[PDB]
DNA sequence: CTGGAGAATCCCGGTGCCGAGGCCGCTCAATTGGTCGTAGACAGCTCTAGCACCGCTTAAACGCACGTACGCGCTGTCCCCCGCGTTTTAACCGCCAAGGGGATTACTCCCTAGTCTCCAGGCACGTGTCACATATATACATCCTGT
């Protein structure tokens, strides 16, 4: 997260098949800049 | 002066993010219509500067000549910033309480301030002198001359 948060420009425009997030508690709230950064990530399937 | 690498740009096509534009709906602020004292414009009148000289005086600008001193280039070499790689660190998070701190809106109200008088005293103007600058008698005062 300390990385994808600010490099989302390169990852957002990608055709991910499975999106996996370990320790999803970092996305506990939608006011933390990660929930937003990771929300619109183009992916087919999502796993928390 | 080329190669020969080697990074750096930099085309160029791609793709969502989000500001730019547009549309809707009221509010308010510019228009309309009309009345009403000024602003200032314009037509004189005055007389103050502004301009235009002219002469005499001489400071000053000026050209020249003539060094010296400062300017520029050169040189040497020697410090202190540049380039770049590593360790450090501060700047971003995210967290976890529970509520206010303060611009913003609004309504009475009421002191303060405009407006508009009439005055009269205090400050622009005319005039009286006094401090500094100016130009001239003067009582000796230094060469010149009869003697």
Nearest nucleotide (C1') to alpha carbon of A36: B17
Beta bridge partners of A46: A19
CA A4 remoteness from chain centre = 7
Name A1's Cβ contacts closer than 8 Å, sequence gap at least 6. Answer: A26, A34
CA A11 remoteness from chain centre = 9
Residue A36 CB lies within 7 Å of the nucleic strand B: no
* Ramachandran angles phi, psi of A9, nearest 5°: -60, -30
**C-beta separation of A4 from A38 below 8 A:** yes
CA gap A11, A14 in Å, rounded? 6
Residue A29 CB lies within 7 Å of the nucleic strand B: yes
Backbone region of residue A23 per phi and psi (left: phi > 0; alpha: psi in -120 to 50; beta: other values): left
CA gap A28, A9 in Å, rounded? 23
Resolution (A): 3.2
- Expressed in angstroms, the distance from the first to the final Cα of chain A is 14
- Give me A35's structure tokens: 């929930």
């Amino acid at each position: 997260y300390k990385l994808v948060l600010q490099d989302h420009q390169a990852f957002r425009r990608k055709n991910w098949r499975y999106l996996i997030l370990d320790e999803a508690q970092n996305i506990k709230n939608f006011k933390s800049q990660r929930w937003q950064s990771l929300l619109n990530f183009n992916s087919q399937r999502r796993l928390l």
